[PDB]
Amino acid sequence: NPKAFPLADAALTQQILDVVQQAANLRQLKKGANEATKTLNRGISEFIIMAADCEPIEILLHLPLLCEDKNVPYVFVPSRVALGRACGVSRPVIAASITTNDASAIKTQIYAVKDKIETLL
């Protein structure tokens, strides 16, 4: 058991990355590690996508502690460059969080991925 434990495989990875791009297009995404912990302790977060290959790993292993505190699903995606490309920014991100909105056109996608990674965990 490594430190980035629930690593989503290929299908769940592109599922996660598609909902990350749609949430970034509809401004429901908050990107970065300490932005992710800010929104995790604030409460506007459905689920949080960390990377599994940042330059240290504990720089974002500080996040699953807050996730098991506040019952938020967390998934390690296997490429920070791919996660930056999905978020739609010009630099590789390592963590992102889906803020809670109810007036959202992608709630069923966000919820289906959230249920899938709750089964995964």
């Binding site: 300490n34 330059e55 504990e58």
Partner: peptide
């Protein structure tokens, strides 16, 4: 401040940390 945050994360969640990062 943010570099201290990052170094402390490495420092706490590694089992036997190193000086390198």
């Amino acid at each position: 401040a943010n570099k201290c945050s990052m170094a402390s994360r490495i420092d706490n969640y590694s089992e036997e940390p190193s000086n390198v990062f």
